[PDB]
Amino acid sequence: GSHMRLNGLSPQQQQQTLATLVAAATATVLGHHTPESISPATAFKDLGIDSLTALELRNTLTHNTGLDLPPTLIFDHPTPHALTQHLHTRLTQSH
Template sequence: MTSEPLTDVLAGLMQELAAVLRVEPERIEPQQRFQALGLDSIRTAELMAALNSRFGTGIVPDALYDHPTPEALARHVRAETATAPGPGPSAPADSAEADICDALRGQLAGIVRCDPAKIDPGVPFRLLGVDSILAAEFVAAINDTYGLTERPVTLYDHPDLATMAAHIASTAGAVRPAPAPARPALTTGEVNALLDAVRADMLTVDEATALLASRPA
């Protein structure tokens, strides 16, 4: 794959960043640090999902530590586009799996705060910024929708939407009820509080999962 000119990559990155921050691109300086722009973990996940979809890359959220400004990240994105693989597999052809995949994409988009259309079913969850807390919330939503008892670690065995949809479709006794109202996504403050509690060993991931599952719909 041929790299795009750096100016084009930076322009595209600034557009996606502005959309995530809900500001005009002109208000962002390319040399300004992401931390100063208020880019928290949720917005970082949303930005990475948008950039990977736009440029066909597989950049992880941790890249912002080594490339802490839009200009630096644009250089990294440009370098990655030269070696990035082609697009991941599209949604499953089987109608049942495709319906499940679409439903999962909507749930995941609400959790990582991005447009569902920007999530490729073949992109690994880790590249979308799905950490242990977000994985717990996502799996809790799956269990509520399909009457399952999956644990967050199932995302390691089924690491993207396409394979997760196939797993749900093939699970004995799985039901596909009419879509229920989506569980409201956690606020940034709630996510950060759970992350802090897990990191401080005040909660285990399983305990955090139980708290998520007990939230009212």
């Protein structure tokens, strides 16, 4: 797990990856929408995320990160943006 062997990226270079991840993640749980078109400043609320699909989103981006993530993930930081930051820290600060 953790394809992060490409480490050495600047914050935003990782963030863009992650903003694409979480978007592709959420767009998959709901089975809709081009992930590239998922706006970071928008809330998963608006994107169509409920409580059940919240965890599925986490599940997806957790499987794509290879680390372990709290079931309160989406409960605490719901946005494509906020997860981008959290997962960024999870990848750089945590190994």
